Every structure is written in structure tokens, then in C-alpha cells.
Amino acid sequence: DTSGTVCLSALPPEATDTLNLIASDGPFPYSQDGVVFQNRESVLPTQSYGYYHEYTVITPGARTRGTRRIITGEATQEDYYTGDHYATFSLIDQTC
């Protein structure tokens, strides 16, 4: 299940950067950016393979991809933010 919705302005600035790169279809900083997100644990609504894709939300100072990500859903304006390494997700509202 999702943990509600959150305004883009309420997320780390890096989340805005990630969405801008998604809008231009990259290029992305990490090789894992753009790969299919399987939603293996069924936290997000059930959809067929390929409906979801994942992108890194850079954590300042991190040597690794960290724990922040944006999962895109194929529907219009459907994007999910997780700041706890896929444990919980919140729908991102780019209008606020």
C-alpha cells in the first residue's frame, strides 16, 4: 500500500532533479536508472511487468545509490518516492 501523497516541493531537491532527467529521458548518473521495477513485494498497485521503472534520487555525500528513489508508473503523472530503500512509498504531486 502507498503512504499517501507528498508535494514535490516537500521532498529533497534531488527528487526534482531526478524528475527533470526522467522528463528528458536521461542521461542518468547511475546504470540502474531506468531499469524495470518489479514491485516484487507488491507494495505498489499490481501491474504487469514493465509498468514501473526505478530511478535514483541522489543522497548528498553517498558513495552508493543510497536509499532514495523515484518509481515511475506508466500512467500520466504517476510517480512514487521512497526514502527508506523500497520499504514505503508516497505518490509525488508535481503541482505543489
Name the pairing type of β-strands 5-7 and 90-93.
Answer: parallel
Q: Specify which residues 73 forms β-bridges with.
A: 52
d(CA 46, CA 7): 24
Active site residues: 54, 85
Q: Which cell is 77 given?
A: 503523472
